[PDB]
Design a binder for this molecule. Structure first.
Ligand SMILES: [K+]
Ligand SMILES: [K+]
Ligand SMILES: [K+]
Ligand SMILES: [K+]
Ligand SMILES: [K+]
Ligand SMILES: [K+]
Ligand SMILES: [Mg+2]
Ligand SMILES: [Mg+2]
Ligand SMILES: [Mg+2]
Ligand SMILES: [Mg+2]
Ligand SMILES: [Mg+2]
Ligand SMILES: [Mg+2]
Ligand SMILES: [Mg+2]
Ligand SMILES: [Mg+2]
Ligand SMILES: [Mg+2]
Ligand SMILES: [Mg+2]
Ligand SMILES: [Mg+2]
Ligand SMILES: [Mg+2]
Ligand SMILES: [Mg+2]
Ligand SMILES: [Mg+2]
Ligand SMILES: [Mg+2]
Ligand SMILES: [Mg+2]
Ligand SMILES: [Mg+2]
Ligand SMILES: [Mg+2]
Ligand SMILES: [Mg+2]
Ligand SMILES: [Mg+2]
Ligand SMILES: [Mg+2]
Ligand SMILES: [Mg+2]
Ligand SMILES: [Mg+2]
Ligand SMILES: [Mg+2]
Ligand SMILES: [Mg+2]
Ligand SMILES: [Mg+2]
Ligand SMILES: [Mg+2]
Lengths: 202, 56, 85, 164
RNA sequence: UAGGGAAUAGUUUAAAAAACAGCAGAUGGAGGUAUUCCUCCUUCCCUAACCA
RNA sequence: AAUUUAUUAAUGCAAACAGUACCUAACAAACCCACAGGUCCUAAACUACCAAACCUGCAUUAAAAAUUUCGGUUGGGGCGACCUCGGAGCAGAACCCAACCUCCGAGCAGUACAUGCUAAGACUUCACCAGUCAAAGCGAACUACUAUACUCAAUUGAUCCAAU
RNA sequence: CUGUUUACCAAAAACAUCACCUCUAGCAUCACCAGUAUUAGAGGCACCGCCUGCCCAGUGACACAUGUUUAACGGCCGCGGU
RNA sequence: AGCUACCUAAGAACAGCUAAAAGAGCACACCCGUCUAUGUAGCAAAAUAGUGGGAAGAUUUAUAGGUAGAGGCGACAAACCUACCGAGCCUGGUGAUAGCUGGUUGUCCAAGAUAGAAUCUUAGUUCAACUUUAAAUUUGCCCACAGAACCCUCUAAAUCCCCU
RNA sequence: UAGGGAAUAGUUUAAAAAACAUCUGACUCAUAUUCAGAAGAUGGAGGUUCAAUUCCUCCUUCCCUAACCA
């Protein structure tokens, strides 16, 4: 919106009277064009689960283009009005204590989707005798797949692994969803050697 | 117009009174320090050149 | 529709100047009317609709002198008639 | 202040960081900022990694320090080598400088078997040692600090308390 | 005029060396704790002025 | 010629508008490991690209135009010359006195740093504006300085406005 | 060359003109055009015949790394002696 | 745009002779308007008489339509756009403005002529000067001595001041 | 009649230097070319400045421009 102001002073009209406008009062100067202002975010309450924005009941501040052109038209979000805030607030109490089941957080769904379609390369050194335990296996998620896994969540095949081979790790994300990832135990190769060996070669 | 010899400078009192007076000096000479009467303190005090006002 | 001084200096020429709003064609949905409308709007209109929490609230809340639209006033009558009946 | 050098200093300051593990038990590293801080915990953790990733009990802790070695004035300070022995010299030690002059200094601190307290003391000595080049309060001299073993990733220490 | 920046042998560069010009040759000048820290002045550049 | 780019066209930015990808140069000197490879002497940190047009706003450059003006003196006008200030003759002796009359100059410089303040009475370029000289007094200097409104002929520019 | 012009003081050597040349444009549903570079438009010059020499420093235009371009605006020399 | 410039739609006219091909020649109708005289409030706000250019073509012409003044149209004559186009006409703004010219209406008496300054000013203004009216109270004019410069060639006629 | 510009060695230029011409030598059988040497100048007059081609002024010679409107 163009905001303008007059160069020339308008004389006071007084109570109950209209200002007397000379032709000189049509000369304007541009105070501000509000399209160039820094953009502010739109506060919405999510109804379904969006891939990156959040999960149902989460107050999300999104770009006005995203909320207006995608979430609100498609029903993915609703306005964070006093009424809508109360409706969703009541639901969050029932989920915590009532019959309504608890649901993954925004990050939890992202990890589950990644954990559904990923394979862990648990590189183990040949020289030293090694036994695979939740703590050691947990370390490899961080290094290889980039997932930060709590040691307790991991459930190993429960058969001691001391030989290169294939097994299965059952990961539980936040205690609700249990994912079984393929496990590929391989001879450990240092980062520099592995990248030069294959990534550079091919 | 092109010719240029002297300059006008502001001499400021060293007494802290803020009293100033303008004097003419040669452009190629060193900054002036003068003993001049300061009305605020009502006696002659040292004045030191601070700024050049214009070219004379 | 107004005038400006060139280079914002009153001692310069006075020129005619028209400032036009940036217009956008957008689709809106009315809950009371259960219909979608393709309306040409401004970014201010979108902001006002967001502050009202929907098109229906904006149409019903906004007085005639602020709507500045015959189409908007017809939507108001439509929504009000459905609520009244 | 060349744009690139100063802009990176602004950018590196921008990198987010957080305190404490997030609520989620299992979370992708990308989804949350850097977390592990305390210098004591960091040394203890680096020992933990050594056990999990089978490697030598004694390893060189190559602390890399992103020390604002520039922006004293709009004129930037220059790289020198203030040499001082640490309280417990590992089995004077030179504070070498970057070749690209991006302000990161690779300076070994201690062997992995060195006790956390001794490594912590070795850390503090370097903090004063590095600021020796520009120990002015005019321009902040330290931004980030990554305590990495030879065969481990760098950990973002909470160096702010130890700076002065 | 305003600030910003700059000044090495006659000339142009380097960290007291080479190259050209004609074995000579230099750290614009002054002051202070030394081309390399700071300050004032000269010359020049840059950028913006030069309205009334 | 001065002023201007509203308008038209181009370009830039903002505005508006979808998403596609996230990064590799070892090497054992010693030792281990049947291999394939590992231990030590670092294996960190770190995201890039990126939405064509139309429309709107702000700039820049063009095009094409718009508004307005084109000083005076002058043995007619034009051309040439001249336009303010001071000294001399014309104007012989209080003042004043012209010509595109006769001659010569000025648009500073130098020394001070009380060229500080204040105040009777006067002069005055024929108006006004501006300009000029000053006792006493205050404060200084001073009992060696033709010391007290500096030498000097002209040596110069109103109001508004701008800088501070 | 036929033609054209100042109706009402100029009919001409002025304009147009066949011809020659320069410039711009790779394309469709209202001119150009229901056309498509042997085309269309913007100009110069003035059939034909012999010709149209030198110059891109300046201005303009074009082009970008220098630069290119006069049938674009235009220009195309002295002084002394034998 | 009933004139005229150019254009659009659909019409019309062009004998005779030569050549038979023609923006070809001679020459009617027809179009134009070279030269001379006449005419000049005329027959005519552009004509008449004779003489001339063209006359199958870029020809002439009837009808309806189109382009409109910051414009149109133009084989550029600054042509033509309703008798007067360097840009039409009408109405309105409008009682435009004019330092310029012209004009300014009964009787009678009285006082009344003039240094200069500034000015895009020298065809005008404003300030001085002069002039007019009313009022105040006190000298005005004419002038005796004495008095007002040296430098420099006219040792000028005079002036200034001034009681009586 | 009015206005602007110019004057440098014998010649033509430069900001007191080059080029030739002139004179001297060498090379050639001799001449030229060439090589090595040498000399020579700030139109005139007046003035400022310690110092004036380089700051001004008048004159001479020459060049260029203008000399119109009814
Ligand atoms: K006369
Ligand atoms: K004719
Ligand atoms: K050219
Ligand atoms: K018509
Ligand atoms: K008259
Ligand atoms: K006048
Ligand atoms: Mg003028
Ligand atoms: Mg005149
Ligand atoms: Mg005359
Ligand atoms: Mg003249
Ligand atoms: Mg007077
Ligand atoms: Mg006194
Ligand atoms: Mg005629
Ligand atoms: Mg005709
Ligand atoms: Mg005729
Ligand atoms: Mg012709
Ligand atoms: Mg020809
Ligand atoms: Mg030619
Ligand atoms: Mg002869
Ligand atoms: Mg017609
Ligand atoms: Mg037709
Ligand atoms: Mg016939
Ligand atoms: Mg014929
Ligand atoms: Mg014929
Ligand atoms: Mg015609
Ligand atoms: Mg003509
Ligand atoms: Mg003409
Ligand atoms: Mg008419
Ligand atoms: Mg009148
Ligand atoms: Mg009388
Ligand atoms: Mg004036
Ligand atoms: Mg007069
Ligand atoms: Mg008397």
């Amino acid at each position: 919106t163009v905001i303008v102001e007059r160069w020339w002073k308008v004389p006071l009209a007084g109570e109950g009277r209209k200002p007397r406008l000379h032709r000189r009062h049509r000369v304007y100067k541009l105070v501000e064009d509000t399209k160039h202002r820094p953009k502010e975010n739109l506060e919405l309450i999510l109804t379904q689960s969006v891939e990156n924005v959040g999960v149902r009941g989460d107050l999300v501040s999104v770009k006005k283009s995203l909320g207006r052109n995608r979430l609100l038209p498609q029903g993915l979000a609703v306005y964070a009005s006093p009424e809508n805030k109360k409706l969703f607030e009541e639901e969050k109490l029932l989920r915590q204590e009532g019959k309504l089941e608890k649901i993954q957080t925004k990050a939890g769904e992202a990890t589950v989707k990644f954990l559904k379609s990923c394979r862990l390369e648990v590189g183990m050194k040949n020289n030293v005798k090694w036994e695979l335990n939740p703590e050691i296996v947990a370390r490899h998620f961080f290094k290889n797949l980039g997932v930060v896994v709590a040691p307790h969540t991991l459930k190993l095949p429960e058969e001691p692994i001391t030989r290169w081979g294939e097994y299965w790790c059952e990961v539980t994300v936040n205690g609700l969803d249990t994912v079984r990832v393929p496990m590929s135990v391989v001879n450990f190769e240092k980062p520099k050697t592995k990248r030069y060996k294959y990534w550079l070669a091919q | 117009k092109s010719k240029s010899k002297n300059i006008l400078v502001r001499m400021v009192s060293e007494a802290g009174t803020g009293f100033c007076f303008n004097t003419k000096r040669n452009r190629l000479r060193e900054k002036l320090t003068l003993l001049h009467y300061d009305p605020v303190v009502k006696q002659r005090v040292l004045f030191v050149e601070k700024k050049k006002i214009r070219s004379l | 529709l107004g005038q400006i001084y060139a280079n914002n200096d009153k001692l310069s020429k006075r020129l005619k100047k028209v400032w036009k709003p940036q217009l956008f064609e957008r689709e809106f949905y009315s809950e009371i009317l259960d219909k979608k409308f393709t309306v040409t709007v401004t970014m201010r209109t979108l902001d006002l609709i967001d502050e009202a929490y929907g098109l229906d609230f904006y149409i019903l809340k906004t007085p005639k002198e602020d709507l500045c639209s015959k189409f908007g006033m017809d939507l108001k009558r439509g929504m009000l008639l459905r609520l009244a009946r | 202040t060349p744009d690139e050098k100063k802009d990176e200093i602004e950018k590196i300051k921008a990198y987010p960081y957080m305190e404490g593990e997030p609520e989620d038990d299992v979370y992708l590293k990308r989804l949350y900022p850097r977390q592990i801080y305390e210098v004591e915990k960091a040394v203890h953790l680096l020992k933990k990694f050594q056990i999990l990733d089978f490697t030598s009990p004694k390893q060189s802790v190559y602390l890399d320090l992103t020390l604002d070695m520039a922006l004293g004035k709009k004129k930037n300070v220059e790289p020198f080598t203030s040499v001082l022995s640490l309280p417990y010299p590992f089995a004077g030690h030179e504070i070498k400088v970057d070749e690209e002059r991006e302000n990161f200094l690779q300076t070994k601190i201690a062997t992995l078997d060195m006790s956390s307290d001794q490594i912590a003391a070795n850390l503090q000595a370097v903090i004063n040692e590095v600021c020796r080049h520009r120990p002015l309060n005019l321009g902040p001299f330290v931004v980030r600090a990554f305590l990495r073993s030879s065969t481990s990733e760098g950990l973002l220490l909470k160096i702010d308390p130890l700076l002065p």
